[PDB]
A paper describes a structure:
Conjugative type IV secretion systems (T4SS) mediate bacterial conjugation, a process that enables the unidirectional exchange of genetic materials between a donor and a recipient bacterial cell. In this article, based on additional data, we present a more complete T4SS cryo-EM structure than that published earlier.
Also, a fourth subunit of [name]/VirB8 in the asymmetric unit of both the Arches ([name]/VirB8peri) and the [name] ([name]/VirB8tail) could be placed and built. Therefore, overall, there are 24 [name]/VirB8 subunits in the T4SS. An intriguing feature of the T4SS structure solved previously was the paucity of interactions between the various sub-complexes (OMCC, Arches, Stalk and [name]). However, from the work presented here, VirB10 emerges as a crucial and unique element that ‘glues’ these distinct sub-complexes together. Another remarkable feature of VirB10 is that the T4SS include 16 copies of them, only 14 are used in the O-layer, potentially only 12 of them in the Arches, with only five of those involved in VirB6 binding and six involved in VirB4 ATPase contacts. One of the two VirB10Arches that we have observed runs very close to the VirB2 assembly site on VirB6 and we now know that VirB10IM in the IM obstructs the VirB2 recruitment site on VirB6, providing two other means by which VirB10 may be regulating pilus subunit recruitment and assembly.
Residue numbers in the entry:
A (entry chain Z): 21 to 50
B (entry chain X): 22 to 82
C (entry chain U): 8 to 58
D (entry chain S): 5 to 174
E (entry chain Q): 13 to 58
F (entry chain P): 15 to 130, 147 to 434, 442 to 532, 537 to 550, 557 to 568, 583 to 821
G (entry chain O): 1 to 49
Amino acid sequence: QERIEGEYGASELASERRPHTPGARTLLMV
Amino acid sequence: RGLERDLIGEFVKSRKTAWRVATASGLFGLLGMVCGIVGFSQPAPAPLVLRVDNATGAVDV
Amino acid sequence: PVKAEQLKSYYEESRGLERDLIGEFVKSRKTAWRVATASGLFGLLGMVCGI
Amino acid sequence: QPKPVKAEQLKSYYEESRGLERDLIGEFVKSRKTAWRVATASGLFGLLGMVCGIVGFSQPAPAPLVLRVDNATGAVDVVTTLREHESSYGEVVDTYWLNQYVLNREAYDYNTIQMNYDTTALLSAPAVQQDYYKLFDGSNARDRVLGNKARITVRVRSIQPNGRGQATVR
Amino acid sequence: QLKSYYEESRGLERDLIGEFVKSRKTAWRVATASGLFGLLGMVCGI
Amino acid sequence: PVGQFIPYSHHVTDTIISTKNAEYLSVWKIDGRSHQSASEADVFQWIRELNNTLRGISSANLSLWTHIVRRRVYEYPDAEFDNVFCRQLDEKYRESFTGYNLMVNDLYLTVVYRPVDQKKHRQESCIKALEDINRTLGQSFKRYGAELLSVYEKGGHAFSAPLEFLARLVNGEHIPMPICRDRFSDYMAVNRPMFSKWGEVGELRSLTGLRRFGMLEIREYDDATEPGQLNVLLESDYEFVLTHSFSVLSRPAAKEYLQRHQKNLIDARDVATDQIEEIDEALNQLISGHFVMGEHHCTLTVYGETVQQVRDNLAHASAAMLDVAVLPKPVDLALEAGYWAQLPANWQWRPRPAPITSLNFLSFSPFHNFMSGKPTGNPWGPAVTILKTVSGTPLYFNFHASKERLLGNTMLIGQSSSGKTVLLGFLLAQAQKFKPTIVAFDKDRGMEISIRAMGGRYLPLKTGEPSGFNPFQLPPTHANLIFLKQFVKKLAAAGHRDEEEIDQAITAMKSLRRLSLLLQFVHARLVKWCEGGDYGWLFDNPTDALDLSTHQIYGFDITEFLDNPEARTPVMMYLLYRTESMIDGRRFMYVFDEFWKPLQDEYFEDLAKNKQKTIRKQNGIFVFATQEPSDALESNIAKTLIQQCATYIFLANPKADYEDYTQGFKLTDSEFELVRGLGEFSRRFLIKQGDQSALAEMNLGKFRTIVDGETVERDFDDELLVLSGTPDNAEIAESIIAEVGDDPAVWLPIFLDRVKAERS
Amino acid sequence: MGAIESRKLLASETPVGQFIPYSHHVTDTIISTKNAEYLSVWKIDGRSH
């Protein structure tokens, strides 16, 4: 009933995230 | 054999009687239905007025 | 042997093309009973509101 | 999930099997037939119930009844065929209506005209109402000519009925 | 004959049992709609 | 649960399973014709005849599924003998197989006939139409050898053969099922597949294990080049179930489809005159070419163990099919629909069928397979042995065949020097697992050492040495008396009143009973057969302790008494009569190294034919042989006996007469070419088994096997050295047997040592 | 549900054909296109630099 072992499942691309420039949040808030 | 014949007997008797009662009760329902639900579909009437002269006490119908 | 008919019905109930047939017509029969009951009650309702 | 079938009767097994298959198909098509038959009957009672429900609605109540009261005797009259005739009765009564009609119809005041306008229509046959409504239309409309710059005062001197639904107003 | 490639393909693609189940289900749905409509009408009258 | 996809309900007649939606069905087990035996000339004719017989019963009701299921066969069981020599032979020959294919192909065709006191008569009409369709298809498939799957009672539990194939389609392992009162859809599945929701691969769920399977969809439109195009898959290292369906289209429907396709190809922005004219040619080829179109999807479902292994199988199959101009499209999300579309009568779940001409369906699935025989289920236990074949497919040899009770007579035509005796010895040694009686007859001491190794009592003969035969010591039964009378008549003929005298003498005439005594009771003529006469050493012996109860095997050598026309007929009547007296209940066999000399016997041939008619139902297996066919066909009765044979094995005989093989043995011209293609000592042979054949290349040279993780080299050189028989070999064996004793395995090491010394 | 969803997800996809603009070979060196734009391919052994 579980995903079948050693097959191609969903993509590994959904793990991607958009990086944030680590100054935008603080100064945007202020 | 016996079981199939019993099931077929229940088929005939009970199902045919169920639909026969369906037809007869539906027809009786139709008779009464048309009758009464046409009856009160016509609006009914109340009393109009009665005259009672305040000065003479005379009553006019 | 009261209701020996019920024992006969159990043999028909046993899974099979025959069980499907029997269950089918009894479902139809109880649909007929339901519709006849609804029509009888609703016709008597019509008569009572009329009268 | 039972054991194998009785092998002593091959012919009986699939003989009854073909019989059962044919009977099942026949009973299922017959059940479909009764299904549409019941659907039609349900539609017929549904529309009978709806038609009677609408016709018995509280629309069109008892027609308003005027218990005409004689001012001299106090005698009380009742609803009559006057609705399908001239309901207004008596010189005194007709001259009042004729007066109020002419005064309100012919008169004008920006400040009170909405009531005189609606009253005139209320006391006019649709043909007459239209003739009246038209006096307030176009560039020469009473609403533009008199507007709120000028007003009309109307007074009736005398009304004398002359026949069968007809009177002269001076 | 049928004389329609769509007609023959869709005839192959179709099963009797499911078609008749759907047919009776739709018939009962319409019957229920009519019955509820009748109840609505009777409520309106009362 | 799972019955939502399986349409099968119950039986309607012995050979026609029904369907839930009333779509009657039938299953045929097609063996298929070999595509190697016949050249490219006859393949087209096969396709054309299949087209003819299909369009003969063409109707919009019909349909056809076709499956090529490949198995790693396990139902072929190991057998334990009761002799060490045969066990040695079996063990080494089985060890010769480590690393081979060991896969069989089975081809199944199913015909489903879905219709599109009237109701009962229509039920009868439907079943009658389908049975007439079955009769026509059976008339058609005579050469292919198909059998109609039908119910088979097993001890009061009626079963149903067609359910087994439909089970293997879904279950993936042959799980027998009984016919019972349910609808078979509920329980026909036992090991239900579990498709991954993304659908790249699948699973199976068995009591004993599991597996993974991915699919391929072979959607091809172009007319095939070869009449069998993708037959490269018939030989591969992976299992699969290759599926084709032919849901016919009624003729107006095909016309309409072609018209719409031509219109939609015309009404485009680019003109391609390589397509429009071809389609317009085909549109009125359909009316005049007489082939009826239909729907067709093709799916290949390779099985495996590891999921990466399944992908490697798919890549290999894709390459091996791009080699044949077809492009496989992998299946990614349609796998559930594809797999549930394999079941016959699952039209609904076909992924994307597209119309295909009838020629192209019969040319994508033409029922070609490398001939492989029956691994088991034979009337005599499993197959005797598993011969190799050119192109690497295991032929499971057996004398059972099918309808040339079960015919078993076998003939082995080829030169004695070129491996005939080795082959016969090998077959008998590995068929010792049956424990049948073998009555061996020999030419030039061919099988003496082999029989004496197998615990027989082979009796070497010899001119001028007491034979030990004394027919007059037989019990005086009615049958024996008749025989003796006939026997003595025959002896007297070597030199009505004579008959009366012989009769009275035999009747009048245990330890004292001999031919010489008979003389005291024609006399002058029988003197030569008595002690002191020219033939006194043969039948006038003092004793005759010679009954078949002591041993199972016996071999009689008449190579001394082969070409001497005086008494071959007598000696053969005596041997045949005594052996025939033993023929009851016991699984039975004969072996004739050369029979055409006893065949020209006037008296013996009629008895042989009548006894054949009697024995065919009594587990009788003749094993005939001949050094060269021209020796056999010289005699006319030999043709009559040859017509009644089941399996023919053909050794390499370059000096083969054209007429003999061509019309004498009912062989093909192409098979005659294959016989000559083998070298002088090729060690291959073409086995025409029934109506299909293959080159069963047997090689008992050096082979490599893994023992305890190390590659060891072994051989059967030693076995063939002890298997064949030569006069020097015979004299060494006789000397040893005389000095050491009787037991079979006590002397064999001594024999090995002496033969090794001879070889040096 | 758990049985029919395969076809439901199947038929609701945009195949790659919507994005590949090619069709029949019209000449042995030239490929057509649904918009009738014929093209040819030139394998080049680029000269040394």
